[PDB]
C-alpha cells in the first residue's frame, strides 16, 4: 500500500468486516466458544487431520474443553494443532503462517557463517533455465524442485536419497 516489500511470505491484510464487525462469538481468534467450522474444510467436507497427532480433536459440545484448536497452512493447507507445535494462538495479520515443515528462507550452519537467503523465484520465461545431466555429487547448494545463473536442475527422489546416504556414509567415519 505504501510501497513496501511483500513476497508470498506476507499474508494479505484482513478486511474490516472480519476484523472489527466480526460479531461477538467469533472474536479475532477461535480462542473462544465452540467453532467446529475450522475443523472441516469446504473443499471436500472431510476432517482436518493434524500432522503430528493423527486426530481431528473436534471434541464435543457437552465437553468443549476436549476440543483442540487446529489451523490450516497458508502454503500446503496442512492441518496442524496449536498444542503440537509450540504456539499460543492463530496467525491472522502479518506474514503468512509457515508450518514447521517447509524449507526456511535462511538457515545457519556454524563452521564465520553462510546465510543462503534462498534464490527467490524467477517467472516462467527464458531466464528460468533447466538442465538435468548429473545426479551424484552435484554440489548444487540446494534450491531444487521435484519431478516424477539461477539454474535449477531436475532433481528426483532417487538422487536425493542417494546423495543423502552417500554424505552420511562419508560423515560417520568422523
Amino acid at each position: 500500500s505504501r510501497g513496501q516489500y511483500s513476497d508470498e511470505n506476507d499474508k494479505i491484510p484482513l478486511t474490516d468486516r472480519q476484523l472489527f464487525n466480526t460479531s461477538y462469538g467469533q472474536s479475532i481468534t477461535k480462542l473462544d466458544s465452540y467453532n467446529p467450522d475450522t475443523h472441516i474444510d469446504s473443499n471436500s467436507g472431510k476432517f482436518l487431520i493434524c500432522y503430528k497427532c493423527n486426530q481431528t480433536r473436534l471434541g464435543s459440545w457437552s465437553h468443549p474443553e476436549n476440543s483442540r484448536l487446529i489451523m490450516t497452512c497458508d502454503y500446503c493447507q496442512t492441518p496442524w494443532h496449536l498444542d503440537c507445535v509450540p504456539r499460543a494462538s492463530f496467525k491472522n495479520l502479518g506474514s503468512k503462517w509457515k508450518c514447521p515443515l517447509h524449507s526456511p528462507t535462511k538457515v545457519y550452519k556454524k563452521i564465520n557463517y553462510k546465510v543462503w537467503k534462498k534464490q527467490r523465484l524467477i517467472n516462467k520465461k527464458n531466464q528460468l533455465y533447466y538442465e538435468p545431466l548429473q545426479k551424484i555429487g552435484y554440489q548444487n547448494n540446494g534450491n531444487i524442485q521435484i519431478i516424477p545463473d539461477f539454474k535449477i536442475t531436475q532433481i528426483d527422489e532417487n538422487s536425493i536419497k542417494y546423495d543423502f546416504f552417500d554424505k552420511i556414509y562419508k560423515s560417520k567415519m568422523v
Partner: protein, 199 residues
C-alpha cells in the same frame, strides 16, 4: 502455483477462460502449449588432457597400428568383461570412499553401452575398418546383432578414454562434470599404472 500453466493456449490459468460454462471438456489427448499457437497466429496475421603418468603406451601403439593393428586373431582371447568386472572387486572395495559404488558401476554400464555403438564413428583405422567390415559380413549370415564385446580387446579402451575428453567439451555441459570425468580418468590410469601385463 504460478500464473501461466495451461496444456492448451494459455489464458492466465492459475477450463476455457473468458467463456461460458457450457464449453468445458476434460478429454485426455496430446498436449502442446506452443504459446497460444504463436498468439493465434499473430492475431490472425493482424486481422582437459590426460596427465603425464603412463603416456608412453599411446605412442607405443600409435606406430604399431600402421601394419600390425595391435591384434592379429579375430577371436581374441583378451576380453573386456573380466577387466570391467574386476573393478567392483579390487578397487571399489579399496580406493573408493565409504558409500555407494555407483560412480564406478553405472560408469561401467554406460561405457559398455558406448562401446556397443562406438564402431563406425571414429576410433577406427582403415585396415581394422576392413576387419570390422568382414566381421560384420561373417556376423550377418545368421541375422544376429553384432556384439563387439566378445570380439574386441581392451587395447582400444584406453585410447577411447583418451579421445573422449576432447569431444566432451563439444556439447553444452557443466564444468564439474568434466572434473568428475578427469577424476575417473586419473583413477583409471593409476589402476592401469602397474597393470602393465594386461592390454
Amino acid at each position: 502455483g504460478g500464473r501461466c500453466l495451461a496444456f492448451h493456449g494459455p489464458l492466465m490459468y492459475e477450463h476455457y477462460q473468458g467463456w461460458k460454462s457450457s464449453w468445458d471438456e476434460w478429454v485426455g489427448y496430446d498436449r502442446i502449449r506452443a504459446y497460444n499457437e504463436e498468439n493465434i497466429a499473430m492475431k490472425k496475421r493482424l486481422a582437459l588432457q590426460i596427465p603425464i603418468k603412463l603416456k608412453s603406451v599411446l605412442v607405443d601403439d600409435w606406430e604399431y597400428v600402421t601394419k600390425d593393428k595391435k591384434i592379429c586373431r579375430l577371436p581374441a582371447d583378451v576380453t573386456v568383461e573380466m577387466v570391467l568386472n574386476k573393478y567392483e572387486h579390487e578397487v571399489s572395495q579399496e580406493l573408493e570412499s565409504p558409500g555407494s559404488q555407483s560412480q564406478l558401476s553405472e560408469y561401467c554400464a554406460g561405457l559398455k553401452l558406448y562401446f556397443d555403438k562406438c564402431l563406425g564413428n571414429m576410433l577406427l583405422y582403415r585396415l581394422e575398418r576392413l576387419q570390422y567390415d568382414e566381421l560384420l559380413k561373417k556376423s550377418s549370415k545368421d541375422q544376429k546383432p553384432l556384439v563387439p564385446i566378445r570380439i574386441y580387446g581392451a587395447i582400444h579402451l584406453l585410447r577411447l578414454i583418451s579421445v573422449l575428453p576432447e569431444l566432451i567439451s563439444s556439447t553444452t555441459m557443466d564444468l564439474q562434470s568434466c572434473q568428475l570425468l578427469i577424476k575417473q580418468t586419473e583413477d583409471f590410469l593409476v589402476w592401469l599404472l602397474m597393470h602393465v601385463d594386461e592390454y
